[PDB]
Every structure is written in C-alpha cells, then in structure tokens.
Amino acid sequence: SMTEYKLVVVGACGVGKSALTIQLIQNHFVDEYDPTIEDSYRKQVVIDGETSLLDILDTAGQEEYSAMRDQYMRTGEGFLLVFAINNTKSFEDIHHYREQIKRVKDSEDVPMVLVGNKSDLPSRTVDTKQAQDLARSYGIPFIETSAKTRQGVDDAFYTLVREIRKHKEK
C-alpha cells in the first residue's frame, strides 16, 4: 500500500521555496528568479521503505492575502519553514509563520521543519547556531539546504514526512 501527504512550503519572498521544490521534482536548478503566484506538484517517493505520494504546494512569499494563506494552512499536513542564510529578515520572519500555522490549525503540535537555504553562498548573515537553537525551542528539525547544489533537499522533504508520520501516532 501507499500513503499521500500534503506538504506546504512557506517563507519570505526570495528565500528559495520554488528552487527547493523544483530540485525535488525536476532535479535541476536555475539562477533566474520566477516569482511565484501559486504552484502545485505531485511526486511518488519511497521514504523509510514506505511508498508515498507527495502533494507539494509551493506558496508565494507574500503578506497581503490572509484568507488564501489560512486555507493553505488548514489543508496542509506539514510545512517547510524556509529562510535564507544570507537574509536576516527572512529568519526573523520564521516565528510569524509558525504562529499563524498554530493559530489556523488551533494546535500546539503541527508537523514543521525549519529550512536554512542558500547554504552554498559566501554571504552568510544568519549563523546556524541561531537556527539550531530556534528549531530546538520549537521541538522541530532544522535542515541546512542548497537548492543550487541539492545539499539537504531530499532531507528537508523526507524529514517533513517523518514528522507528519510521528504526529499521526499521537
């Protein structure tokens, strides 16, 4: 048998939500920025010996459309919280995303993974200890990624699926 999961990728504009998704789905990366309105993807994977369909919702980094945002959070079973290691504001935004997700879902315990993206770049402004400590304060995993080198990409999505599975046991 198999299972299916609705994953939602959120975070500030420009952090690499789409590039991460396109690496997972299409195994390539481009420098050109194509700003997202909304996109969806399906991919069948095997995680820990269990076959699953990932329904991935790639959202725009925007803060003007709260009713669409809320429906994304209602339907999603797990969320990638993506910031960029050379965008300090995108890291300062993370807590807002977790707060909104918990509110819409009316829960203290929602499957989430913290994603520190663009780890290939020499222009770091967020040190990883900060992100490690934040994820610990949330009790969620922290995964370092680069959509450009593919480092951590499978790890981020698969870890999110494991968090969903761990949540379902409760």
């Binding site: 920025y33 194509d34 700003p35 997202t36 309105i37 909304e38 003007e64």
Partner: protein, 164 residues
C-alpha cells in the same frame, strides 16, 4: 488635456488589437509622465516589444518589464525606482491603469490593467490612468492568462506611442 497613449497588442507576433489609455496627468503628473515617455520611447528605452508576462483572469493584465524580460525588472525615466506620488485615485473597476511595485516607493515601469475592481490595492499601488478604447482587447488578453498568471501564448506590445 490629459495625454492619450496607445498599445498595439500582439499574440505570438500576430496583431490582436489596439488599447488606448487616458493618463491622469491632471492628478498624478509624475507617474503619468513616466508611462507617457515609456510609451513613446523618447528616452531611448520603453515598452515597445515588451510583454504582458502575468495575466490572472478576474484580476489584471500585468506587463512592462523591458529590462529583464522575465517579470522581475523594469525602470522608470527617473531612475530604477521612484516614490509613490499620491493615492488620490482608487482601483474602482475594469480598465484602471495602475503601477506595479515591490512595496512602498518602488515604482519602475511595470504596470497592470485591472479587469475587475481591486480595492484591496488602494493606498498601496498608484492609479494613474484608465483604458479609453479597447476594453474588448483587454478582455481578449485576459483569456490568455491562467491561475498563476502564466500566459498560453506570448502577449506583447508590438507598437506603442502617444495619440494626437
């Protein structure tokens, strides 16, 4: 005395039709003058050849990136960006011509034509003109859009200039 400009719209190079705009120089002089000059090309750059890269049915047709040709660029006649002039005019219905931006005081060349009332944009995007003739051409353009703004054929401003 408000200026009128024209766009001749093309679909994969084939003529679709003409859209003309009244520019509200009486109320929004600097923003109208940018769009006027970009339409004539008199500064040595402008809209001629560029595309409507984002068309979302029920909301708007968005174009004007003649520097990066991918939805991320554009520039004004005053520099790369200029501040929001005023918010006197609102997004009152179909045919409103308004500036796109990436937040406060980031006007460049990108613009959108509303195909519906978009009142949540009031106070955040500067309105500076309206469609005069050719709302039927704008409605045709809107049919080439999609949920995420991607267009089914290439929609371009094949010609443009000032009417008079």
């Amino acid at each position: 005395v408000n200026p009128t400009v024209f766009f001749d719209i093309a679909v994969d190079g084939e003529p679709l039709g003409r859209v003309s705009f009244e520019l509200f120089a009486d109320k929004v002089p600097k923003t109208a003058e940018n769009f006027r000059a970009l339409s004539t090309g008199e500064k040595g750059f402008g809209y001629k050849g560029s595309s409507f890269h984002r068309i979302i049915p029920g909301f708007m047709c968005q174009g004007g990136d003649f520097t990066r040709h991918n939805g991320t660029g554009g520039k004004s006649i005053y520099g790369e960006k200029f501040e929001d002039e005023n918010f006197i005019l609102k997004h009152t219905g179909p045919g409103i011509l308004s500036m796109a931006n990436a937040g406060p005081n980031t006007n460049g060349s990108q613009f959108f034509i509303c195909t519906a009332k978009t009142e949540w944009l009031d106070g955040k995007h500067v309105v500076f003109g309206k469609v005069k003739e050719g709302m039927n051409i704008v409605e045709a353009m809107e049919r080439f859009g999609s949920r995420n703004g991607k267009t089914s054929k290439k929609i371009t401003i094949a010609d443009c200039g000032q009417l008079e």
